[PDB]
Amino acid sequence: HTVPRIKAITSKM
Amino acid sequence: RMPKSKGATVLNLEHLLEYAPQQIDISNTRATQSQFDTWYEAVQLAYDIGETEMPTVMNGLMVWCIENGTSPNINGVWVMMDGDEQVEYPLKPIVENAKPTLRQIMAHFSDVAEAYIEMRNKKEPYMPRYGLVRNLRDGSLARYAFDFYEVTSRTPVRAREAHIQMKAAALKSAQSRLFGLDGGISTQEENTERHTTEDVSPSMHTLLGVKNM
Amino acid sequence: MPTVMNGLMVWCIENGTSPNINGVWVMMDGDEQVEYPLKPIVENAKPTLRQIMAHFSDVAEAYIEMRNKKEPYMPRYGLVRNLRDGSLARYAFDFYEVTSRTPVRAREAHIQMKAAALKSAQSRLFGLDGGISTQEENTERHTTEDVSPSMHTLLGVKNM
Amino acid sequence: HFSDVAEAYIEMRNKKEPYMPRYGLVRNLRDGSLARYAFDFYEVTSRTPVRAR
Amino acid sequence: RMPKSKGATVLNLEHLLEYAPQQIDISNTRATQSQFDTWYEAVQLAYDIGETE
Amino acid sequence: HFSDVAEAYIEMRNKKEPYMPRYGLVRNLRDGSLARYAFDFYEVTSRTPVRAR
RNA sequence: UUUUU
RNA sequence: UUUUU
RNA sequence: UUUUU
RNA sequence: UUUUU
RNA sequence: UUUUU
């Protein structure tokens, strides 16, 4: 169970 | 004596004797399951995270809060431990989709948070930072020293008193303001008056009754 | 409707009967939450919702004593007031109706709880008045002959 | 005339997302629970609670 | 009793039992490692000082 | 229309250096944490926090 | 009563 | 609503 | 009497 | 009920 | 959270 890394500005906005 | 309306009994004894809900399920100080589901979906969609690795993020979020509070004014990022690395997640989805408040949303995590703090208190002294800020002098009450603790009928009397005193000391005499500065800025009236080349001044048209000598 | 009344009585035994309660109140359907708006409950209650729910006092006390037989069930109002005695859990709701059969200790506990909850809440008879216009309507005319939008002539003015 | 349905609609939208009407944002209302009452064509009746009034 | 959303549990017990971060690492009253690194780099570049001294 | 992306961009630039938009400097805003909200075309929504509003 | 964009 | 360089 | 969320 | 960073 | 020179 790795810990995810999110982006600054997601394209889903 | 039971409530009556037009002679007919208002209650239902058969259902009442079998109606035994959990206290935290009907409590007003905790977000409803619908609101919790909406917040969870909104956070998951905002983070662009699938169902497999969202529980890990929830694990990290619960720990972060046990330490640094659940105020409505928290901003910036919250951090997670990936081994020895810091993973920073924005705090906007967590606090902006939380209805009615983030504290009432995180009250769902209260039992697991207490269990986690009691478990961390087995291999090292682990007092949550909220308990340090309130200057709690008893380590044994470390499982009860977070701001989103949910007092239930099973909470011991000493723990309940300590939590109440901590809440009273933290809130102090904070006055609640219902309004802020109004958004309507224009306090004057629009000047519909015309301006013409015949005017004697930009502010006046003629000097009608003025008499020179 | 009696089932809904059953759920409403329980919800209140826990979360109070103030005039300012809003939102929704929940009922247990097995393991599911059923949410009912609280506006009909508090808007049609005369003179107050507390006085309406005082009719449920005996059944509420019986229900709390019955729930206190299979698990520790202190109503949330008794937790907020920090009541240190579980045996007085049947008496720890805000719509309790003190009668001549209520024991002296229960009566004293209820009175102290009410005094601690009400504190020194000042009662205001009025709020901000709804009449907003504090000025007078400007019935004065405006004409092309005016020297300014605020003045008609400059009558006595003498230039030098 | 639309006041009751408008209040019901705002309370219903306040169940799946935070929905404060823009009039309530302009007036800088700091309480979300009073979002059903924050439009300019609200019609105060005898059933409107004192705090909302 | 553990948090649930649509019947599925929200937390992860297996990772939670093994999640033991340092308190100062997740604390809000201390700059993040990224911010500390950025400050250190900025100070080093401004001082025109190499890594040795 | 660019308000959400502008706020996200200012919060992202506020991760590698202090980036207060010049509009926030002109208005003499004394809090850096409110740098994502300090442009004149900000669009206040129901998700904007009370302090930011 | 109106004046709340 | 506009008027925030 | 009300004011106890 | 909220207000506990 | 900030505000401790």
Author numbering:
A (entry chain Bu): 42 to 54
B (entry chain Ac): 55 to 267
C (entry chain Ae): 108 to 267
D (entry chain As), F (entry chain Aq): 162 to 214
E (entry chain Aa): 55 to 107
What does the paper say about this structure?
CP consists of a highly conserved globular core flanked by two large extended regions with a high frequency of structural disorder. Here, we show that we can control the shape, size, RNA encapsidation ability, symmetry, stability and surface functionalization of nanoparticles through structure-based design of CP from potato virus Y (PVY).
In all three structures, there was no cryo-EM density for the first 41 residues of N-IDR, exposed on the outer surface of the filaments. Beyond H42, N-IDR in CPh+RNA folds similarly to that in PVY virus, whereas N-IDR in CPr and CPh takes a different turn at K53. These filaments are mostly RNA-free, of either stacked-ring or helical architecture, with only a small fraction of the RNA-encapsidating filaments resembling the native virion. The low proportion of RNA-encapsidated VLPs suggests that the efficiency of assembly of RNA-free filaments is higher than that of RNA-encapsidating ones at given conditions.
